[PDB]
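Hi again,

Forgot to attach this to my earlier email, sorry! This is the prediction with sodium ion bound. I've pasted everything inline since the attachment limit keeps bouncing my files.
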Amino acid sequence: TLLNPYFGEFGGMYVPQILMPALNQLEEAFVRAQKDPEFQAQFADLLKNYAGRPTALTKCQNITAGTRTTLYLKREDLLHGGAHTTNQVLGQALLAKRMGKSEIIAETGAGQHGVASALASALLGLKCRIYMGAKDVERQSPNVFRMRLMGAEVIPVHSGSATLKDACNEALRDWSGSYETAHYMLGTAAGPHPYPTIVREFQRMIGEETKAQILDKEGRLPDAVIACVGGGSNAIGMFADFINDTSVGLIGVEPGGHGIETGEHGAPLKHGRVGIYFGMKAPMMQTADGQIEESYSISAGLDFPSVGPQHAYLNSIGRADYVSITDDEALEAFKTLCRHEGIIPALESSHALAHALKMMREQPEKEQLLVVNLSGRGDKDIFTVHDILKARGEI
Amino acid sequence: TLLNPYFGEFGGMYVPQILMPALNQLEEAFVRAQKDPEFQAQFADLLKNYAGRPTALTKCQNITAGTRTTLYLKREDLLHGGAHTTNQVLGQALLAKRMGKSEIIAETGAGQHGVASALASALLGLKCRIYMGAKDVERQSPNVFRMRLMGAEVIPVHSGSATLKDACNEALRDWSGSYETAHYMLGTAAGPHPYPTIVREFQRMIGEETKAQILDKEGRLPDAVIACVGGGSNAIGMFADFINDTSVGLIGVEPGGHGIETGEHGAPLKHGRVGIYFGMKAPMMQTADGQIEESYSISAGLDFPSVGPQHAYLNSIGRADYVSITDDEALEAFKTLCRHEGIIPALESSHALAHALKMMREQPEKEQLLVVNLSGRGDKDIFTVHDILKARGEI
Amino acid sequence: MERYENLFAQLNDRREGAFVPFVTLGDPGIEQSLKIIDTLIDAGADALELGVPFSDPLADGPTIQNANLRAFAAGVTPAQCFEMLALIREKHPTIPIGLLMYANLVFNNGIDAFYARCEQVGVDSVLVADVPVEESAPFRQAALRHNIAPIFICPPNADDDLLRQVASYGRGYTYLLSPLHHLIEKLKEYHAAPALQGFGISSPEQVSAAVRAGAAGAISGSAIVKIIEKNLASPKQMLAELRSFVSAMKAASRA
Amino acid sequence: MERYENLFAQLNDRREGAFVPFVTLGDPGIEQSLKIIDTLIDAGADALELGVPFSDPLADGPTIQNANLRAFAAGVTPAQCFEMLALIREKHPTIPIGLLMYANLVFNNGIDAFYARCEQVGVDSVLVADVPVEESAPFRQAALRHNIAPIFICPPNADDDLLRQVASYGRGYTYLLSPLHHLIEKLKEYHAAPALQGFGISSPEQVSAAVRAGAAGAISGSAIVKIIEKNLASPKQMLAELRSFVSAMKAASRA
Ligand SMILES: Cc1ncc(COP(=O)(O)O)c(/C=N/[C@@H](Cc2c[nH]c3ccccc23)C(=O)O)c1O
Ligand SMILES: Cc1ncc(COP(=O)(O)O)c(/C=N/[C@@H](Cc2c[nH]c3ccccc23)C(=O)O)c1O
Ligand code: NA
Ligand code: NA
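Structure tokens for the complex follow:
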């Protein structure tokens, strides 16, 4: 390889031999593109003129009242498509075309990677097929309609837990047979090298912008940046530029689901153990005898029993801290942002917000400047949430 | 009055005497605010840091293929909330607070004015009640959930056509009794003075930005700017800055519904006659004996039997041209943008696009630079459209 | 105009207050409507305020909205209303008749034309719900030209300049919307047309209360409609109920 | 390792090709599985390739996915598989036995520990589906240390460097995935372990076709599983069907 596939002991390329050539080809294209001014120009043009970068950095007006916390929201919910997922898809799509691929394969849970893949495909003239767990098709339904309207083929996966990992399985199986004409547009900073690297580099602008914005507004770096972690793309995109800024805390939030103790969560980084799956060596939710355990989260976008290798590494060296947030905590954070800031966040993003609220509430007289990555908008979640709030009497 | 309430013969203040004081108060506050640097600063801050201005100006890549047309889309679909409606609500909300009002009244059809009112209310700490026709509650359902989640009270109007005009009626009736504590946040550039004026001024940035953007990208003004017209806010916001640029064509598109000849449309500017209703003297859809006729459009946001007075005036002097687009034409334009540019537009905006496509298709060798106001995104419309495409076999 | 003067002249001579009921023309039907109107007059109404059904009554509450719907259902049009007005006037030559209109109905076939028509059928005044004094010029001028009294509403939030305008422009009577006693004083001082209390008049006490306060009478804006509504099934009872009500309201005006 | 050498040595002496059926351990049940395996051997299988059920078989098609589910349903675990392997080896001392694994099952309790266990039960080779030659170091080293042949797949898109690597690192046999005749030549030239054709082997012609082409034999990757699947209701028929199939496939290998 041209680049290092490992982050400490995590990462690698654990795929059937038949896929190695495809990965090597991708890595090569990526290295070349990165040095290609023409590529850089095109990417930047799409980000700016089509996707709507740079996204705003909004200062919360009400939710920090009565505390010494200053909270800013990196508005990825404002990106065309409705989430951070759009950034990297544009980059990958340009790569696909450069490699002469005419078809796209993708997996999605929240349907945000799915939507982004479909829009990029429509624009660049690629044929798109998307694998989505049957459970997700149901709970993130609005996104299914969007995908279909843009001409993408949506394939429901009924096997296993009928969620992200199951869609991931199907996508890899598909690619194994179609690598010649199809590019696998992996949705997160996980999987085999070079994906973790590529996705980070194509999401890097999140943190780069945040730094410039916060410095402009506050004249100093944040005390901490907080982001949810499902696969690890939005977090790493936010974290990347701050890694060398030691004074800046990096907090990743994994889904606590029903609660860690229940076993129904999606927090492998802190509660799993190293394993080999989905082409990588990383922390995983697994049984005693090495079978992959099914994750659980109210949030389709975080419902994945593993995590990107760079996160596992950052944790191990203690550069970044990882915590968990339960379903109930995320719901409250969702409700709160809606009613007090007039922003409807994705349930995924609500996990990161819930943690920031905890930080402020627990130590109200502690002076701190926080930045939360508002990874997406909650349009996709409204039917789901409404029916919960209702069943409780909060709506 | 401090300002001229008339545009030629159109406009005025045709309301029950009891509301005059409220209108005079509003006009005064507006005049004062406009000269208040503090107000200007706050407004600009919210537009930039909260709403996400300036919006991009996207050049279409595929849909103009095989023609000499260059089409740009002013991306109001990227504004927080999902439509241009957010711009003016922020301005009006600041006015409400300046006037010491604590409650907000609003009407909505598409639910976009409704959403914007709710988000602005949540942020500025105002109590919000929204009138929405029962028909609209159904066909624009996604927006009802959004409104409710943000803590707004949504009141279904079952009288008459159960659409915009009916909600307008109820809102005015409400205000007549609550003007002391409630501000009426009228959703378009129509109604009694000073609304047509205020809404134009608080939407003006659309055209101002477009001009700067197009000049930067093309080094020249557009041949024409096209926008849909329901009440007239998005069009006037786009048109305002170009009025003195005589070389620039201004095209407003009214809904043709089932077709003009069917009588089931919402095109009063071209197919109605001057009347007095909703506090203004303007072109209206009316019976021979002066009863208000019910409009019709697939698009909830355009389903209104009248139009803002400045549009009536611009037409009369021949500065702007107005056309109509049928349901079927809008649907095709919707489908096309989705599949070829990876953008899901609101059905309202699809009306304006449909006209631009007609312009290019009819005279394919005519060299022209067009700008369409993509007033909003189509998330609100997906269930509606999907079920039509389906019932036909195009999905 | 004159019919109003004659009324107030005579009313004064008996130290009586005016009792003016509001009814929607054609509610709940043409024939029944005519019957109702006869009953009000018989029961003691001093003058009449009649509404012409409008599609979008943006200044009316549910009671009047419903009335309009009933009339519309009965196939009532502005043309039919004018036909009814002729029949009424034919039967009752001296009773002052006032119309409550929406601007679009007046504007529709020309302002002047509308007022000429009123004159022809024998209408005494016209109140246009959605035309403030500020926009009234063309309306009040056409009215005057056709010997019709332009009626203006004096809202609770009226200022001095409003009082003066209304005093100047109005004829027939002033439609008061409830400092009450202060409003009366100012209007009198400005030589405004006799003031009638329009807000809240649903029971006899309110009538006497208004006269006592200095008003020339009271307008019952929806109380009558309510009775119609509730007795739809029994027209017999309806008329009986209306008779008793009006009679009681009028009696309350002798003080 | 040795069991493979002995096989190829003897096979060669009869100018016979190797016929190796793939089966999932514990499908459709423990006992029935054992029965099936006995039948394959009896019917003429030269060697065995056995799968250990893995939760997320990302390199397998629906046939094998289903097999895994059946095994899981039967309560089969990796521990049970090792128990079965012992019983098999006890009965059939010379037949070469190869395992088809997923890396997580190997990695779980330590790589070295896994291979030591294989050695103990009498397993001859291990193919790890999701470990490319590029990542194989630790796996192939532990295998060698425990006298286990590390099996590597030679994909259709193999290049010269791949061929050389596989020739160097592999033992027992080379798992070929279908220029076919060119691949064979190069592998032979590089002194790679005897090549077995793994792609498409579902009928006897394909067997003979492979041997004729220069392969040392053929692996039937899912053809057997299909028979199990279809005869779930009748184990009797299942065994009969398997017997006939294997017998026919083996016969095809004598050329
Ligand atoms: C709005 C939003 N926020 C946060 C996340 C969490 O993702 P991440 O941890 O990468 O920052 C998602 C997930 N979006 C993808 C997640 C995804 C796509 N493919 C995957 C493969 C493995 C794991 C996750 C994904 C989706 O379901 O559409 C999201 O849609
Ligand atoms: C996305 C989008 N595009 C275009 C329009 C057309 O509006 P306009 O002609 O003003 O540019 C709308 C309507 N939005 C409002 C329209 C509206 C609110 N109040 C009104 C009163 C009268 C007439 C129209 C409206 C809504 O139904 O939420 C819209 O939501
Ligand atoms: Na995870
Ligand atoms: Na209209």
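The first helix of chain B runs from residue 20 to 34. The radius of gyration of chain B is 19 Å.

That should be everything now.

G.
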